[PDB]
Amino acid sequence: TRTYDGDGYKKRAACLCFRSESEEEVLLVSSSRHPDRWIVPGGGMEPEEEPSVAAVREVCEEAGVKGTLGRLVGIFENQERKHRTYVYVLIVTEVLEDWEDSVNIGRKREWFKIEDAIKVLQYHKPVQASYFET
Ligand SMILES: O=P(O)(O)O[C@@H]1[C@@H](OP(=O)(O)O)[C@@H](OP(=O)(O)O)[C@@H](OP(=O)(O)OP(=O)(O)O)[C@H](OP(=O)(O)O)[C@H]1OP(=O)(O)O
Ligand SMILES: [Cl-]
Ligand SMILES: [Cl-]
Ligand SMILES: [F-]
Ligand SMILES: [Mg+2]
Ligand SMILES: [Mg+2]
Numbered sequence: 266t267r268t269y270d271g272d273g274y275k276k277r278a279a280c281l282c283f284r285s286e287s288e289e290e291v292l293l294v295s296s297s298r299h300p301d302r303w304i305v306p307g308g309g310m311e312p313e314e315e316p317s318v319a320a321v322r323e324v325c326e327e328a329g330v331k332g333t334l335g336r337l338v339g340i341f342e343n344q345e346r347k348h349r350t351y352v353y354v355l356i357v358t359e360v361l362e363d364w365e366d367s368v369n370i371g372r373k374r375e376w377f378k379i380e381d382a383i384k385v386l387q388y389h390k391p392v393q394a395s396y397f398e399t
């Protein structure tokens with residue numbers, strides 16, 4: 266069930282999943298519709314779901330990782346697609362081998378240096394590239 270803010274924007278949550286507290290390498294996942302493209306793992310908030318809870322759940326489902334939830338980086342609008350995403354830091358402490366989206370849709374995951382994550386996100390996901398702006 267998709268949820269919406271009062272202005273009709275779809276409610277989403279995502280994490281920047283870092284390998285360590287140095288926040289130098291981030292985990293991206295493949296697009297479902299276009300597997301040759303990279304995205305930041307995230308998705309729709311459920312009814313009455315706290316954004317931090319949705320972020321952690323979506324990262325588990327799409328990236329198959331768990332870790333220590335850190336700060337809210339910010340709330341990011343995509344005007345073109347009419348969605349609003351809460352973006353958190355997550356420091357990865359558990360990497361699971363057979364996760365929901367790997368089993369169900371063959372979703373891939375890969376570590377990127379921050380500069381390279383920004384580069385691969387720019388063309389199709391410029392708002393996601395902006396999550397790393399600080
Ligand atoms: O079709 P796009 O390229 O506009 O993006 C797709 C994106 O596909 P992707 O970014 O993977 O190409 C999906 O993401 P996902 O299939 O990788 O999960 C994403 O879904 P979402 O991440 O908001 O939703 P859920 O993760 O499932 O909760 C949205 O799909 P949905 O809203 O039909 O569930 C999104 O569509 P819009 O909200 O219209 O932008
Ligand atoms: Cl790191
Ligand atoms: Cl986006
Ligand atoms: F999902
Ligand atoms: Mg999802
Ligand atoms: Mg998603």
Ligand SMILES: [Mg+2]
Nearest residue numbers: 307308309323
């Ligand atoms: Mg979802």
